Nucleic acid binder design. Structure first.
Ligand code: 1N7
Ligand code: ADP
Ligand code: MG
Ligand code: ZN
Ligand code: ZN
Ligand code: ZN
Lengths: 400, 396, 186, 186
RNA sequence: GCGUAGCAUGCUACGUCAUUCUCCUAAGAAGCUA
RNA sequence: AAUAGCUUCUUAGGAGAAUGACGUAGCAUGCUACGC
């Protein structure tokens, strides 16, 4: 059960239990995270609580390594050693971790509640590993906040799609939009059991609402709807690939004169082939994605992937691609999601089409020649990590 | 009753020196259970008897090779150790000799089982091992004959067939001699009674069988491990024509096995001291040790080096378990340390230094991962040439 | 075993035995202190046995966790270890032919089939650019893997045979690269 | 152990003995307390050893029961698997022609090889070369074992399909021999 | 002269603890030979 | 992903034996308090 110090990249065998994501910490790094922050739950290959039955000394600073088992001061074994000593914490590879001074920033990112611009403005400018960590922990934090608001119940039965909802009085109510789905638990006494997933819509008058469930279950009065959970997996791949230049064009092959109506962009169509990655700022209502399709023509057989953050945006761009390209084109966007609908054109899972149009949530893990994310003004460092992780291509261009 | 069966066929994955792939046949359990119950007593009684012809289950360690080699010279007159080898022994043994082998191994239940019982047992063994329904790659087939190497009674059946070829060649070589030129007055009478007891008679002759077998055991001492033989035949006779010779073995294999044993693989040593040229793939040297002289077995160095350098699985490539996988190689390669050729003298100290270096890097990594180590001291006894030198002495 | 409890008790018992045999005491007190020595030795011995047992119990885990970690590590990351070791050995081989084909394979010109051996057999290697072209090509001899081949039928990326004349830097930018060359061993 | 009757008697015996020694009476009470604690510790050894045996005995019995349950579970599962395979195999064979030929046989005994040789409805020829192809199963229909078959699919060694046109004397090298060609009785 | 008692010593039996040895079983990892 | 034989190593268990120490009972001997 080993890993790399999220600050010093040495092998370590520890984690912070009180910190939300429990990241690997080198020995001195964990010492510094635990000395001056209220976080005092450190997990080794086994937890560090005193193993004496009924002893709950949980501050790592107050335990002792015994023989085979650690303990608290009162219940300590005859001979043993103090754990937290000489600015270090006894962990595997104790001597060969280096440890660094990124302690203040990490403390901040760990204890903060993100409610002020500090966390964003700081995660935007910190170290890459630390950046990714801040992104994952912010996601998990907002996910945990999702749990704070309450449950819905039924009040009166009227029809199959006209129901009166009842909010648990005294808790934040959820916004009635398609982006909320809840599992329906019915309590007989004796078989508190889910009935299926449900989504609501505030009709023309309250408290009547029109709604859709995944199943055609008959809604009784003993039913209620509780929010459905969501988690976060950890990501490793970089956010922004290190920039590189060259003196020739490789992997992509030019064209002679095709599509003269895409003329002015060729001067930039070449430099993209010369560099490893680049960006295009497009003022509102400009020729953006026109340049995209034009380069797509300029390099015809070069396999291309398009991606964005907005489903409306990726739909619009896949349609525009349908307007001028051989088809011979797929938009593997969403099979059974996207409450506001989208393409109904081609495959979702075949990994064969040259020009793959997809969304971050449903990106596969394939290769290609060039990939282009779009609309960078909305996506976050996390989304950047996903789109750089799942795919792998020669050249990268972002337009926004 | 009888019970046909299906036996699979798999390619083997192990070191070798010829680019042909060797297969092995794994017989179906419904046959091994019965064969085991039927033969186990005799087989576990053959593998635990020291000082007889069939030498199976006699280690070469702790002074075993020297005792084998000094038993073979059971006081023959002018020794000349020889050898031989059968080509394609597993795929040419005629059905008749396999049946004779199974009969001679089933000749012990003279009182446990009745006669019809013995016959149905033999028919069962024939239909299960000899001519079965091989299943080679998702499609049945039919074996024409010839033994299979995955049943219970394999090495012992091979040993029996081997002794049968030796005695047949001997009989042929004694008959074919002219007869009027044999000077002695005993062996000539022996031939003159051999032919008559062979063809001009119909029932057993136990007294004469005994005399012939004693004559053999006094001029043709053997040592047999399932097809690897070593003979110590008297030589004046063998030249006058009265015991076997490589020419006679060539002939016998020509009309009974139906192959041709070219004489490029039948080593014939003429000096008794230096021992057999090659038996069971271990040359033999004579090495002074403790004021008396003993024989020692020593492998072929290239094989040891190969077994160290090329491993079959990826996890066996790190010196985690190697600290143990090397003690065994060194144990097998010790006798090279008394050879006169220098590289044979060095393929020992190579392993011996490698073990030490392995253990030192091990303590390094361990004292890094934690900071302590208590009693892994005994390993200081594997990198000294005394522990192995204990392994070829006769006390235990 | 100093810091252990019973070392002190047995030590003081042996010390008192010494002080009494040197003090010229009687034999009855000698026997009772012999008893004290026996019992202290007993307790210290039992505790020492217990501690030694705990030691030999810890060592099992201390030496098994290491095998586990190392073995799972080796087995997991192998598909890269093999390739890295391969290219290390291949640099260290220090051959010329291999070095030429490797550099070429780096900067684009890869072959599409097993290079043959005999003095009459086919070979189809691509060429991605004019620069690399004039780097390798010369007249009718196309040098590769340190041998002498002859150019047979240059083909464009649109299945359009071209002769050897048109291949010229100024004339280059109108061909649809990459070409595909076939050859024959001299 | 602590719940044994000797435990409390022994503890209070040692306690009251220490109390009387703190009282410092005549040594007859010392002898009495020695005797008391002696017999107490004797029966204490007795019961301690009994419990020590009981632990191992119960644990042996329990692991034995686990082993028995495991064996029975596996046994029942394997028997079900065997029966299922037997019945699903049986319900396949072409019962009609088999009934025909067996009931034709004068005893109900027919050597095994002719059973497939005369009731199989398929034929999986395997061919190692264009020549034996030409000479065994040419064209679209062929004859073997005195009956008329017809091709239906010619899958090569890579488990691909091969149109009957591709197999031509000049198109031999591109086809990864052997050539598993099936058929159907007709 | 005897017994009760006490002490000391030698012997025997029993019941605990520790050290070693020996053997047997079981289970596991690795090597070699036909 | 077979049959068989040998050998190195590790753990657990059992059995047995030796040794030493502790405690109980019994046997022997001596010294002495008391009693006749
Ligand atoms: C007895 C041993 C050393 C004794 C000593 O005197 N050390 C000296 C201390 C080092 N100093 C002096 C540099 C400070 C100490 C040090 C390292 C400790 C182990 C590892 O953590 C982890 C491992 C996994 C789980 O945890 C369960 C058990 C393990 C085996 C632990 C048990 C025990 O606790 C160990 C063995
Ligand atoms: N070279 C051009 N000639 C004519 N129209 C162009 C050219 N480049 C871009 N456009 C047009 O701009 C229009 C779309 O702009 P839009 O994509 O709406 O702006 P933005 O993408 O920045 O939000 C399209 O009609 C597109 O063809
Ligand atoms: Mg756009
Ligand atoms: Zn660190
Ligand atoms: Zn913390
Ligand atoms: Zn405690």
């Amino acid at each position: 059960a080993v890993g790399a110090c999220v600050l010093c990249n040495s092998q370590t065998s520890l984690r912070c239990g009180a910190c939300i994501r429990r990241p690997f910490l080198c020995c001195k790094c964990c010492y510094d995270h635990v000395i001056s922050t209220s976080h005092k739950l450190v997990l080794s290959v086994n937890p560090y609580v005193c193993n004496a039955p009924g002893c709950d000394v949980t501050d790592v600073t107050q335990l002792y390594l015994g023989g085979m088992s650690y303990y608290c001061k009162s219940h300590k074994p005859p001979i043993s050693f103090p754990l937290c000593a000489n600015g270090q914490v006894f962990g595997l590879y104790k001597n060969t971790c280096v440890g660094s001074d990124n302690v203040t920033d990490f403390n901040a990112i760990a204890t903060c509640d993100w409610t002020n611009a500090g966390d964003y403005i700081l995660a935007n400018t910190c170290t890459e590993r630390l950046k990714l960590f801040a992104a994952e922990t912010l996601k998990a934090t907002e996910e945990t906040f999702k749990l704070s608001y309450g449950i819905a119940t039924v009040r009166e039965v009227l029809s199959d799609r006209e129901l009166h909802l009842s909010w648990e009085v005294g808790k934040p109510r959820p916004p009635l939009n398609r982006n909320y789905v809840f599992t329906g638990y019915r309590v007989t006494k004796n078989s508190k059991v889910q009935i299926g997933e449900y989504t609501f819509e505030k009709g023309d008058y309250g408290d009547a609402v029109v709604y859709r469930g995944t199943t055609t279950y008959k809604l009784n009065v003993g039913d209620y709807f509780v929010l459905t959970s969501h988690t976060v997996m950890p990501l490793s791949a970089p956010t922004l690939v290190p920039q590189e230049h060259y003196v020739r064009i490789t992997g992509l092959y030019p064209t002679l004169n095709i599509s003269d109506e895409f003329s002015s962009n060729v001067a930039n169509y070449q430099k993209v082939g010369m560099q490893k990655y680049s960006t295009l700022q497009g003022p509102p209502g400009t020729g953006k994605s026109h340049f995209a399709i034009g380069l797509a023509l300029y390099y015809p057989s070069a396999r291309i992937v398009y991606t964005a953050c907005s489903h409306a945006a990726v739909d619009a761009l896949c349609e525009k691609a349908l307007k001028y390209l051989p088809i011979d084109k797929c938009s593997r966007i969403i099979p059974a999601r996207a409450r506001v609908e989208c393409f109904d054109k081609f495959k979702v899972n075949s990994t064969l089409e040259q020009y793959v149009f997809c969304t971050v949530n449903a990106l596969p893990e394939t290769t290609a020649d060039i990939v282009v994310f779009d609309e960078i003004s909305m996506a976050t460092n996390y989304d950047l990590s996903v789109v750089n992780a799942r795919l792998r291509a020669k050249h990268y261009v972002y337009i926004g | 009753n009888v019970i046909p069966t299906i036996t699979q066929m798999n390619l083997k994955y192990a070191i070798s020196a010829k680019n042909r792939a060797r297969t092995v046949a794994g017989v179906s359990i419904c046959s091994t259970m019965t064969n085991r119950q039927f033969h186990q007593k005799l087989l576990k009684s053959i593998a635990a008897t020291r000082g007889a012809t069939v030498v199976i289950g006699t280690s070469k360690f702790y002074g075993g090779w020297h005792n084998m080699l000094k038993t073979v010279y059971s006081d023959v007159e002018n020794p000349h150790l020889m050898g031989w080898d059968y080509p394609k022994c597993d795929r040419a043994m005629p059905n008749m000799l396999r049946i004779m082998a199974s009969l001679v191994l089933a000749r012990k239940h003279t009182t446990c089982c009745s006669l019809s019982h013995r016959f149905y047992r033999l028919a069962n063994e024939c239909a299960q091992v000899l001519s079965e329904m091989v299943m080679c790659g998702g499609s049945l087939y039919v074996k024409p004959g010839g033994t299979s190497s995955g049943d219970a009674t394999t090495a012992y059946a091979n040993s029996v067939f081997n002794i049968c070829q030796a005695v047949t060649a001997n009989v042929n070589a004694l008959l074919s001699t002219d007869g009027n030129k044999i000077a002695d007055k005993y062996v000539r009478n022996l031939q003159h009674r051999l032919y008559e007891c062979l063809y001009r008679n119909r029932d057993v002759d136990t007294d004469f069988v005994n005399e012939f077998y004693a004559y053999l055991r006094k001029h043709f001492s053997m040592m047999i491990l399932s097809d690897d033989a070593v003979v110590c035949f008297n030589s004046t006779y063998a030249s006058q024509g009265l015991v076997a010779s490589i020419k006679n073995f060539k002939s016998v294999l020509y009309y009974q096995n139906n192959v041709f044993m070219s004489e490029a693989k039948c080593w014939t040593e003429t000096d008794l001291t230096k021992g057999p040229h090659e038996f069971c793939s271990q040359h033999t040297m004579l090495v002074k040790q403790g004021d008396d002289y003993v024989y020692l077995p020593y492998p072929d160095p290239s094989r040891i080096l190969g077994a160290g350098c090329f491993v079959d699985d990826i996890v066996k490539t790190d010196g985690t378990l190697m600290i143990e996988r090397f003690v065994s190689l060194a144990i097998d390669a010790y006798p090279l340390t008394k050879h006169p050729n220098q590289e044979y003298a060095d393929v020992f100290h190579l392993y011996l230094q490698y073990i030490r270096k392995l253990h030192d890097e091990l303590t390094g990594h361990m004292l890094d991962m934690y900071s302590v180590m208590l009693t892994n001291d005994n390993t200081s006894r594997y990198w000294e040439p005394e522990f192995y030198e204990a392994m070829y002495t006769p006390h235990t | 075993f100093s810091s252990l409890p019973s070392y002190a008790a047995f030590a003081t018992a042996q010390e008192a035995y010494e002080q009494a045999v040197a003090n010229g005491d009687s034999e009855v007190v000698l026997k009772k202190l012999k008893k004290s020595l026996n019992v202290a030795k007993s307790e210290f011995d039992r505790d020492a046995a217990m501690q030694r047992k705990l030691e030999k119990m810890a060592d099992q885990a201390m030496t098994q966790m290491y095998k586990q970690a190392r073995s799972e590590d080796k087995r997991a990351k192998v598909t890269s270890a093999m390739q890295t070791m391969l290219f290390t050995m291949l640099r260290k081989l220090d051959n010329d032919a291999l070095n030429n084909i490797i550099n070429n394979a780096r900067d684009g010109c890869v072959p599409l089939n097993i290079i043959p051996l005999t003095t009459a057999a086919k070979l189809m290697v691509v060429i991605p650019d004019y620069n690399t072209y004039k780097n390798t090509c010369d007249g009718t001899t196309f040098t590769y893997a340190s041998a002498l081949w002859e150019i047979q039928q240059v083909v464009d990326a649109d299945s359009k045979i071209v002769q050897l004349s048109e291949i010229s830097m100024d004339n280059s930018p109108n061909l649809a690269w990459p070409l595909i060359v076939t050859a024959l061993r001299a």
